Amino acid sequence: FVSNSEILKPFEKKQEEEKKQLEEIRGNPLSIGTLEEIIDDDHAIVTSPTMPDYYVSILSFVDKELLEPGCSVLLHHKTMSIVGVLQDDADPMVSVMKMDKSPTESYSDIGGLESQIQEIKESVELPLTHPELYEEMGIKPPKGVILYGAPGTGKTLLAKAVANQTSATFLRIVGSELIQKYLGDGPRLCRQIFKVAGENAPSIVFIDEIDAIGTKRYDSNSGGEREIQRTMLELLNQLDGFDDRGDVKVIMATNKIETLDPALIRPGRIDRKILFENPDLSTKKKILGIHTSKMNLSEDVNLETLVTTKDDLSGADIQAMCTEAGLLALRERRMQVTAEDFKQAKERVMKNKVEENLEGLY
Amino acid sequence: NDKVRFIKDELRLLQEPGSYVGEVIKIVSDKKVLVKVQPEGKYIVDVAKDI
Amino acid sequence: KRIQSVPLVIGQFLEPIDQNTGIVSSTTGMSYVVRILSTLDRELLKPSMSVALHRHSNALVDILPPDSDSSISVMGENEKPDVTYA
Numbered sequence: 001f002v003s004n005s006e007i008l009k010p011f012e013k014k015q016e017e018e019k020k021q022l023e024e025i026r027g028n029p030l031s032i033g034t035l036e037e038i039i040d041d042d043h044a045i046v047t048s049p050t051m052p053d054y055y056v057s058i059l060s061f062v063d064k065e066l067l068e069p070g071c072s073v074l075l076h077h078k079t080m081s082i083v084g085v086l087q088d089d090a091d092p093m094v095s096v097m098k099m100d101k102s103p104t105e106s107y108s109d110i111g112g113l114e115s116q117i118q119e120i121k122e123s124v125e126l127p128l129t130h131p132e133l134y135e136e137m138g139i140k141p142p143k144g145v146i147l148y149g150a151p152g153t154g155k156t157l158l159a160k161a162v163a164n165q166t167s168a169t170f171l172r173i174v175g176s177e178l179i180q181k182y183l184g185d186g187p188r189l190c191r192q193i194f195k196v197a198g199e200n201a202p203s204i205v206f207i208d209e210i211d212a213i214g215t216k217r218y219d220s221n222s223g224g225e226r227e228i229q230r231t232m233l234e235l236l237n238q239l240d241g242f243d244d245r246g247d248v249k250v251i252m253a254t255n256k257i258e259t260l261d262p263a264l265i266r267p268g269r270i271d272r273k274i275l276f277e278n279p280d281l282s283t284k285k286k287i288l289g290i291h292t293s294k295m296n297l298s299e300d301v302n303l304e305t306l307v308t309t310k311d312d313l314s315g316a317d318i319q320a321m322c323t324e325a326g327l328l329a330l331r332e333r334r335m336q337v338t339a340e341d342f343k344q345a346k347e348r349v350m351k352n353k354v355e356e357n358l359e360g361l362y
Numbered sequence: 363n364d365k366v367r368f369i370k371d372e373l374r375l376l377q378e379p380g381s382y383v384g385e386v387i388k389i390v391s392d393k394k395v396l397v398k399v400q401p402e403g404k405y406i407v408d409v410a411k412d413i
Numbered sequence: 414k415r416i417q418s419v420p421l422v423i424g425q426f427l428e429p430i431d432q433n434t435g436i437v438s439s440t441t442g443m444s445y446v447v448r449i450l451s452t453l454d455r456e457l458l459k460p461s462m463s464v465a466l467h468r469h470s471n472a473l474v475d476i477l478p479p480d481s482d483s484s485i486s487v488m489g490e491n492e493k494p495d496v497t498y499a
Contacts, residue, residue: 026392030406049403074406089388369451373416376472380445383436401442 025059028077032086038067044082046073056081092196098172100163107161110154112286113315116274120145120162123272124249128166128202141246143239143269144204147253149276152314155253159206169203175210175254178231181221187234194238194248202247210252214259232261239269284310284318291322300339309346313354320353321345414452417474422466424473429455437473439466447472 033046033054042058044067054075058067061084067073074083091099110117127134127141134141147155163170173193179186197203213228239250250270254260267273279287284307292303310318324345329337384397387404398404424437433449445466449455450473458464458476465474 026394027408030394032404032406365451372448372451375448376416376450376467377470378447378472379470380447380472383444383446400444 025076026083030083031075031077031080032072033075035067035069035071035073037069038064044073046075046082048075054080059083061085092200094196097196098170100170102164102167104164105157105160106164109290110157110161111290112279112283113154113158116276117158117161119272119274120158120251124204124251125162125166127246128168142271143246144249144251145272145274146257146265146270147251147274147276148257150278150314151255152316153276153278154315155276156208159208159251159253163204169197169201171197171203171205173205173207175207175212178207178210178212178235179221179223179227181223183223183227184230186223186227186231190231190234190238194242198244198248202249204249204251206251206253208253210254210257210260212260232264236264236266239266278312278314281307281310284313287315287318288322291319295322295326296336298336298338301337301342306342306346311350317349317354320349324348414450414475417465417467420468421474422468422471423477424464424466424471426458426460426462426464428460435473437464437466437471439471443471445471449473450475 031048033048036045036047038044038058043055044058045053045055047053058064059082062073062082063085066085072086072088074086075081076083091097107117123142123145147158149155171193178190180189194205197205213232216222285303288303288307306321321342325337325341328341328344382397382399382402384399384405387396387398389395393409394406395409396404396406422439422441424439427436427438427444429435430446433451433455434446435449435455436444436446438444447466447470453473453476459479462479463477463481465477466472467474
């Protein structure tokens with residue numbers, strides 16, 4: 001009664017009297033446009049989609065720090081004066097940013113690699129989850145880790161399980177999209193990748209399977225030798241010339257990193273290097289139990305017997321036999337997969353899916 | 363008789379400037395809709411009182 | 414119907430909406446939605462049919478015949494059969 005009369009009454013009265021002036025201001029068709037530049041005299045220039053040229057002052061409902069060249073504002077119909085700034089809603093423009101709805105892929109499925117799993121967790125997840133360890137230590141945390149190894153070692157699922165527990169922004173970019181058909185748009189894209197990701201949350205830029213600029217065989221989007229130097233060196237400047245407080249992490253992984261320019265790595269930013277090899281008979285027993293955890297297997301199927309038959313296989317080849325064995329039982333509609341399906345599954349994988357490498361020594 | 367009154371009153375409808383053409387983009391809590399005209403740019407107008 | 418007289422604008426019909434109401438697109442590039450004149454009919458025109466409009470109000474006037482002038486061909490062949498196929 002007494003408090004509401006001295007607080008809510010004078011405030012709501014000024015709000016009702018203010019909105020009466022908003023009719024002559026925020027009324028009208030309210031044309032929009034693109035902001036050009038500002039000045040300390042409180043003036044700007046806006047270009048509507050009809051491409052006019054207008055120079056007016058700065059009205060209320062807008063801040064000087066909110067005005068940036070290339071943004072969207074709100075003009076007026078008659079007076080043609082800026083009403084205010086209009087922020088972009090419904091996500092930051094491009095929605096393919098891989099905002100990670102978090103399917104929640106845990107570390108139990110990538111198990112058996114724990115020797116190399118705790119390696120990336122300390123240089124990526126640890127500073128994000130427990131920043132007090134690196135801040136109180138005094139050392140600067142690394143900006144990421146480079147991965148190298150044969151295909152099938154689980155390099156794709158290694159970085160996927162890290163972003164699950166961090167609950168932060170994480171990106172997935174294909175290395176073949178760094179080069180476009182138009183000349184000059186290659187480095188322009190790399191500028192917008194790190195710009196938008198760095199504004200919202202301590203994001204992570206992860207570009208997987210980079211074939212960029214090698215074994216071209218590209219008729220359409222080939223830009224010559226000029227696209228080579230502009231696109232690659234643009235990524236190097238994002239780790240050098242681009243300033244950051246340490247919230248941006250860059251992790252690159254592919255089949256062969258030797259074809260890439262080693263100057264792009266610049267391993268003063270990346271102090272962590274993780275390799276990968278083929279698992280032994282003890283590791284494959286843990287990986288096989290992962291895929292068969294939700295699978296229904298018969299009583300005549302032995303887990304140690306299937307691992308013994310495995311010779312020169314990666315983590316992807318183990319799941320390939322579990323998938324092929326499920327397709328054989330799916331044709332006959334069997335709940336529990338019998339032992340006859342694993343016999344025909346291992347023969348098809350070692351034939352087609354598994355091809356003899358060009359190493360050939362011994 | 364109604365056809366006599368409908369045609370004579372059509373002069374006010376013919377002399378009317380008519381209406382523009384646009385599409386809905388986004389809406390706000392102020393009951394103002396963003397109408398995008400195809401030749402022109404985008405405009406923020408007030409929604410009809412019937413809907 | 415005769416109030417329009419000389420000062421007419423060339424329009425083009427697009428799609429029917431309401432009874433005695435249709436959307437038109439003139440040569441100026443600005444599309445307007447006006448009401449169909451009582452002496453006209455929706456069945457006497459075509460979806461691509463070109464019509465006439467007022468200078469200012471741009472109201473529907475009359476349905477032009479199904480002959481489009483434009484440019485190039487215009488009417489038809491002029492002195493074309495100068496040769497044979499042999």
